[PDB]
Structures are given as structure tokens and as C-alpha cells.
Write an enzyme that holds these catalytic residues in place. Structure first.
Site, PDB file in Angstrom:
ATOM      1  N   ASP A  17      -1.045  -7.436   1.938  1.00 16.49           N
ATOM      2  CA  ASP A  17      -0.373  -6.133   1.936  1.00 16.49           C
ATOM      3  C   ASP A  17       1.103  -6.262   2.328  1.00 16.49           C
ATOM      4  OD1 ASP A  17       0.117  -3.313   1.883  1.00 16.49           O
ATOM      5  OD2 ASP A  17      -0.807  -3.055   3.889  1.00 16.49           O
ATOM      6  N   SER A  48       3.699   2.350   8.415  1.00 17.46           N
ATOM      7  CA  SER A  48       3.319   1.326   7.439  1.00 17.46           C
ATOM      8  C   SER A  48       4.521   0.641   6.839  1.00 17.46           C
ATOM      9  CB  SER A  48       2.457   1.945   6.345  1.00 17.46           C
ATOM     10  OG  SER A  48       1.408   2.744   6.865  1.00 17.46           O
ATOM     11  N   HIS A  51       0.778  -1.241   0.000  1.00 16.18           N
ATOM     12  CA  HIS A  51       0.000   0.000   0.000  1.00 16.18           C
ATOM     13  C   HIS A  51       0.820   1.308   0.000  1.00 16.18           C
ATOM     14  CE1 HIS A  51       0.171   0.203   4.425  1.00 16.18           C
ATOM     15  NE2 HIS A  51      -0.113   1.493   4.253  1.00 16.18           N
TER      16      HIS A  51
END
Ligand SMILES: *[C@@H]1O[C@H](CO[C@@H]2O[C@@H](C)[C@@H](O)[C@@H](O)[C@@H]2O)[C@@H](O)[C@H](O)[C@H]1NC(C)=O
Ligand SMILES: *[C@@H]1O[C@H](CO)[C@@H](O)[C@H](O)[C@H]1NC(C)=O
Ligand SMILES: [Cl-]
Length: 234
Positions: free
Chosen positions: A89, A185, A41
Site C-alpha cells: 500500500d 492515510s 488506497h
């Protein structure tokens, strides 16, 4: 990182900073001298030529002598990465050179090929250079929070049945909100000195137990990870 503390400079030598347009955008870890594991992502709608991988950093705004900056020769998103659900992801970054391993730049071990994900209550740690509050406050350096693995059903219920079988959750050890936040992330969740998780998604409020911290369950991707590494290896 919310509800965490500033790590000792270079105490987590595996930490990577993925920069886009000079700014930090995502975290990740050094799997091999030239391989970085991150979240897919992070690269969604981005020009790979504007991307930089920094290793050996503590204070991102400081040109630290321990810092090693590399370009991305190839990005391998998981073939089954679905952006809406955040399923699979994960991604691999093959750098335009090899990191010179030292006391400030190190490797993180993946879980075993025949290893199960941790059980509810297992103490883990999440690190990064993401926001430290809901007011977009930046950290003084690489932060780290103490979290505990949360039961998958309790999490899936909180997330209205939107969790995949390859996703794990954390909670705080106490009454304080502890977990990741925007720009953490890709960075790993370390349980028993192994990268069992990968920062994926949260709620509106960082570390809010109503919207628990969702990580990519890494043990499920160990085989894929080595398959992609071997493919571009002599
Ligand atoms: C997560 O849970 C899903 C079912 O969730 C429940 O049922 C749906 C229809 C909604 O009413 C929702 O609010 C409920 O919590 C399962 O479909 C899915 O397989 C579960 N995933 C995992 C990893 O167990
Ligand atoms: C690696 O990539 C960066 C960014 O694209 C570039 O500045 C650097 O010169 C590259 N190094 C080599 C050896 O190709
Ligand atoms: Cl390598």
C-alpha cells in the site's frame, strides 16, 4: 490523529495534503520538489483530475501564504498493491511542477537501501489532519502523536494472521490510545528522522490497542521508489 498534539505551525515542512473535490482525503510527504510519497488506497476509485497536493500547510481551511498547491501529472501505484489485504500500500505522486523549498516546505529522507525496519519499542511520530476522536472531530491544524514500534508477531496475532512481511505496527507509550485515524492515510511514520512507515489501516476505534495501527514498511520500497523516480527524470 488520536492521542496526539497540534504541531508548531510548519514544524514538519515535509507534510502533504492530498485533496479530492476540494476536501482533504489523505496525507503524504515530499520526497523531492516534484515527488510525493503516499498510500495507494487513497486513490482507489478516484478521478486524478479532481486531485490536488497542498504543501506548506498547517490549517487546511486557511489560504496560508506558505501553501503551495499542485496537480498530479502521474500516479504510480505499486504494481503489487492488493486492496483487500492492504499489501504494498504505497504510491508515488509526480506533481505538475516543482515545490519551491523553504522554511515551511521541506523534504523527508527515506531509510537506507541496506537499512532494516526498527525493532519493538523504537520511539516514532505520526502526523496528519485526520480525525482526533471517534466522533469525526476535525483537528485545529496538523497534529502529531508519539508512538512506539510494536512487535510484529503480537500485531499479526491481534490482526488474526493478516499482516504481510512488509508491514509494521505501533502502540502507545502509555495507557492512552495514540495513533492515526481516518484521513491520516499516506502520511509518514517518522523514526529516527526517516520515513520508516506509511499510514495504511486501523480498526473501528482509532488508536485501539486491540486493533493496532498498521503502516507500510517503507525500507522494503526504497529501491522501487527511486526506480520510479529515475524513470520520469531527465
Ligand atoms: C502472520 O501470521 C500468519 C499465521 O497466523 C496464525 O495462523 C493462522 C492460520 C490463523 O490461525 C491465525 O489466527 C494465526 O495468528 C502467517 O501465515 C503469516 O505468515 C504471518 N505474517 C508475518 C508477517 O509474520
Ligand atoms: C497544476 O494543476 C492544477 C490542478 O489541475 C492546475 O489548477 C494548475 O493550473 C496546474 N499548473 C500548471 C503549471 O500546469
Ligand atoms: Cl524532483
Amino acid at each position: 490523529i488520536i492521542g496526539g498534539h497540534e504541531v508548531t505551525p510548519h514544524s514538519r515542512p515535509y507534510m502533504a495534503s492530498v485533496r479530492f473535490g476540494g476536501q482533504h482525503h489523505c496525507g503524504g510527504f515530499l520526497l523531492r520538489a516534484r515527488w510525493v510519497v503516499s498510500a495507494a488506497h487513497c486513490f482507489s476509485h478516484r478521478d486524478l483530475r479532481t486531485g490536488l497536493v497542498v504543501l506548506g500547510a498547517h490549517v487546511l481551511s486557511t489560504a496560508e501564504p506558505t501553501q503551495q498547491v499542485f496537480g498530479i501529472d502521474a500516479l504510480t501505484t505499486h504494481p503489487d498493491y492488493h486492496p483487500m489485504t492492504h499489501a504494498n500500500d504505497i504510491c508515488l505522486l509526480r506533481l505538475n511542477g516543482s515545490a519551491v523549498l523553504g522554511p515551511a516546505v521541506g523534504l523527508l529522507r527515506l531509510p537506507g537501501r541496506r537499512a532494516r525496519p526498527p525493532t519493538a519499542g523504537t520511539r516514532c511520530r505520526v502526523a496528519g489532519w485526520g480525525f482526533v476522536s471517534d466522533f469525526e472531530e476535525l483537528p485545529p491544524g496538523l497534529m502529531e502523536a508519539k508512538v512506539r514500534v510494536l512487535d510484529p508477531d503480537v500485531c499479526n496475532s491481534s490482526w488474526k494472521g493478516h499482516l504481510t512481511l512488509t508491514m509494521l505496527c505501533t502502540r502507545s507509550g502509555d495507557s492512552h490510545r495514540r495513533g492515526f485515524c481516518s484521513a491520516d492515510s499516506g502520511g509518514p511514520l517518522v523514526c529516527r528522522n526517516r520515513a520508516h512507515g506509511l499510514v495504511s489501516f486501523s480498526g473501528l476505534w482509532c488508536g485501539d490497542p486491540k486493533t493496532p495501527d498498521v503502516y507500510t514498511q517503507v525500507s522494503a520500497f526504497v529501491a522501487w521508489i527511486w526506480d520510479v523516480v529515475r524513470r520520469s527524470s531527465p
